[model samples]
Target: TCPFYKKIPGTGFTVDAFQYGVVEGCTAYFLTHFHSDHYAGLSKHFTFPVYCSEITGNLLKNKLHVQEQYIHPLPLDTECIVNGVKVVLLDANHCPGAVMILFYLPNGTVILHTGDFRADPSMERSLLADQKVHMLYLDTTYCSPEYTFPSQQEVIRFAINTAFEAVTLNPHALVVCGTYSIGKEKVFLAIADVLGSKVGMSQEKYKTLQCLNIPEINSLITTDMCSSLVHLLPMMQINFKGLQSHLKKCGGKYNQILAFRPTGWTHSNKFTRIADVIPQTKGNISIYGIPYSEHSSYLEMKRFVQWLKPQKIIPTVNVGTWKSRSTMEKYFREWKLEAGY
Candidate 1:
């Protein structure tokens, strides 16, 4: 049986194990990002010192109202000693403040914990290329081969072109994009900037964006719904029924609604072409499922594993069931063998 707290075996530190309360013998708590699932148990009353990226620290303070004293913000690509252990933070490429943590233990063991990352070409040129990772704590959010989709750039271009086409066909079309609180900013931001339209969101989300310190975000955001043609909604609200209700609430201001629901699950190998993913349409609402995923695809994961070739591989996600873990292990063995290691 696995313990509730997911401790990193040898290290006294625990990564993203807040929900299990305080784990015994924990020296420092490491938060990968500010996503709800990772930072679930963190609260004002909790007293453990937390280490995370600078942006995540700001978010923890402004969004979660965590005290400043308990939050330790680390710089990207810089090494620091925490509790007598050498630690470094690298950009996760997942969200604004997400990071991949590297731990160098005293006994010469190296551990790389990729806290929900999207593998990119630039990461290979960085400090990661030099170190031989002994253990890799991976984010297996999409470990199966069927999860492979196109690159983020291609998906973004597709989304942008789709929005442009929709707006060109119907000038009065209300363009709505679904987004998570922290991730999927690129898809909607590109849409708003390309269309030269203001983005409408709730005040709370606007405040959260402000903490991110994106230069163009302040000018693009609008609290008044009528002032902006492009509006942001929670991912769940992008459905046909949801958009129908939303448009009904709009009081006939918009002629039609063109919505983009961006997620990795929308695309699979069963589909021949990327565009063949198709859109669900009914009445005046058209909802497109854009494959704009922040997580790495299966091919991307394979490339990462081949490049790193860690001595041991551990799946962080989709590990709740024994069968799920075993399935991931099969993929890991195949990847390792293919790498000729």
Candidate 2:
């Protein structure tokens, strides 16, 4: 929903997009994060004054080639005015420079747009404490109770330990880890830190991570493919067909190739097979299914709604597939928030 911009009542600004309908008339644009899904269609055509985190602004300038004047970098927790509305950016904890947007309308209403975030209790003290939120635009990605998995820290720990265990079992085995285009930098960094080695990445991935301005992460990533025992590659490289190409680079000394996918889909208590590779030992890939999610789980979303007692709740994703707001009516009635709720 990159180009889908939502209008904030009484704020006179649009949230998240610069598409046909709202671009010309809207006063400004507020981008909560730099995820491609959220930043889609934001190419050279972007013309409106866009407000986002410093990392996101830099990414837009460096990667997407957007003009500097149009990109306005908003410092975290700092309140600024746009179209007569007070807006603040808070850490979303999803990825670097990701933020939860808070809108303070002139009518004394508080609106929060959690871009893409893993809701943690610690966030309440800084961003949500003692605030009466009137409108909540929620991220409902893993809105089912089935999304019950450990926190991001645990996931990183699990991934790192499992990768080490893989290498320990067979010293010659090549340990490969998979991640999407963005996110999951924590796992790679943790693996490198624990092993006291540098992680290898393609030039493109390095450039993307560099724009985040995370200096510590620089210590972990390297351009040389043979830099570390643990190799970090994109999700596309984890499949059977993708793993074939990497085998040539392994120099044939490795007896086996163990792939670990830190994802949410493998909740089956067993590694679900997606493909069969030549030489079965090379196909030894497993899923930890650690719930290092960036969106609210069902339990977390309910808790957030109950805490805020928002008069209205709207799903950020265009599709209503998420089960997050199933009991929002019951909750609103109990809290006596709004008639239409």
Candidate 3:
């Protein structure tokens, strides 16, 4: 069994949320995205120059109040050197500024860290096929067969359609979307553009969107939810009371409220999935979970390793060392060879 360490043990590097005291010895720090889980332990007192996308740096400065001096923006898909190690950042297809990191070590070995990214076809053409991938730090968040679901594009269609349908069914009804704090900006933005509606949010969320610097998205922030037909509420605030308070504040102007949550859990039959009717109004209000996961499914992860044929796999998530190692061996060793990698 392998021992767990705060840093990427031998690489002299710490990535995304891992900023334990001993990490000061690390040559460099890398942040794949601005998700709270990934961007943990970063603040004013944090003592390291963090490398990430330009937008991510802006978020760190505005949202977290971290000084801009410690943040370094790396151009996406461009190769650069850090402490003599060749590094390349690629669009992760997860969020606005999320990226996948490829580290070319001095020993002619290339290690790729897929930092919570969904499938992207453009990477295949740009990636050097001849350059052998010696190791891969996989996402492994949905490392199981049951996670098979539709892509983000499909989920977008379903969610937006549902939101519009809710409006059509009851023109006076209020439509609310449950999304993460940083990610899922596109989902809300799309709905706003298509329905010609504005998204209502709290001042905190509004401030975060402003830091994004996206012109169209900047207009989405509204202090009044009742006035706005479409509302973008954080996932945690989609509960019964949350909806009740918003409805109460509407002062009986709205007839009904419909909420849609676009997440991976929808496909697993874990949540109450309905038929053609998008939102299941099983409770006091209408709600549904649409499949729009940002993480790669088990099948995608397998195919990724099969194509790259990485000699070793360092799972980013804690999947139980022995069991995960065995599962990974089946993919990287037996499966890759069987697939003629």
Candidate 4:
């Protein structure tokens, strides 16, 4: 489940809370990105004014069919005032339209809300370094030490190399890459570019990709399944039964299917070597679960917290129960002490 807290403390603005309906006292709504977990509650009927990144606003209008009057697109790395509170949007480095929001209150309190982010060194060098954050609303999806995984580039390169090698051996092999509505695009895009193959997907998904405004991917998308060796499917469809059925639907056009399931859940400390994170095979179909996470790992999150040194930490995820929240907070305290704050 995503974060249940819709309201940002000490402000009239609510960040990604359309699911709870019209939150009382929330004069404005801010959407950090277009992912379902963050934009779950939003609909065409939502009457509140929504503020989000320019790409996110385009997606809201193109995908969700939200009215333009209700959507306000903000430019990245720029400051703007919403309902008298100073606000700035910075690239979250998670997905195409995702952002990390910074809010400055009148009482001289600064709050940084990471709407779902993968920590990057560039973020620490941005305007964020200039401010002293008082509170931080973090994305604690992979808060535990066990959830640490390789960087996104490493996983993407792995996927590219894996697909390249497979196709080199079996020239008739079909590569299938799984992805969410908005995340994990970099993985499949990189693979398609490396393989120099067009990506096949449903017409609906093609239209959604068009909304993203990524020019390079436009020429790589194909509606006809037989035209392209590399295909994109939903994350759930990468399983053995699903791939078997998919291959059957293709009418014997390909010899075997090599599917890449890029996600954070695929990795753990148990796997000492990256190459040992093997794929699950069943006859003509194989599923490679790559640890290509958009969210920050345990060490990355700790490094972010230590650098910012926020006075208080409020977790956006894994806060449904007291035990989960307390466990995450315990890690936060340890990091705080290590940072000498």
TM-score ranking from best candidate downward:
4, 1, 3, 2
* Model 3 lDDT, residue 140, Cα: 75
* Residue range 20-63, candidate 3, lDDT tens digits: 54454676788999888788678877667788899899899888
Instruction: Put down candidate 4 lDDT per residue, 1-341, tens digits, no spaces.
Output: 32336567777888887776667778888999998877987878777899999889989998898988999998989989888889999999888889999999888999899999999777889999997999899999999988777777777777888989999999888999887678788877888888888888998888888877687665878798888889988889999899888888998888899998776675354565556667889898888877777888888888888999999888889888999988997898899888899
Q: Which lDDT values do the candidates have, in the order given?
A: 0.85, 0.70, 0.73, 0.85
Residue runs of model 1 more than 4 Å from their true location after superposition: 1-5, 266-269
Better of 1 and 2 by lDDT: 1
Encode model 1's per-residue lDDT on 237-264: one tens digit a residue. 9988888888887778888999998766
User: Which candidate number maximizes lDDT?
Assistant: 1
Better structure of 2 and 3 per lDDT: 3
Better of 2 and 3 by TM-score: 3
Report RMSD (Å) for each prediction in the order shown. 2.0, 4.7, 3.0, 2.1
Per-candidate TM-scores read: 0.94, 0.85, 0.88, 0.94
Kindly provide the TM-score of model 4 when superposed on the true structure, using C-alpha atoms: 0.94
How many Å off is the CA of 258 in candidate 4? 0.8
lDDT of 4: 0.85
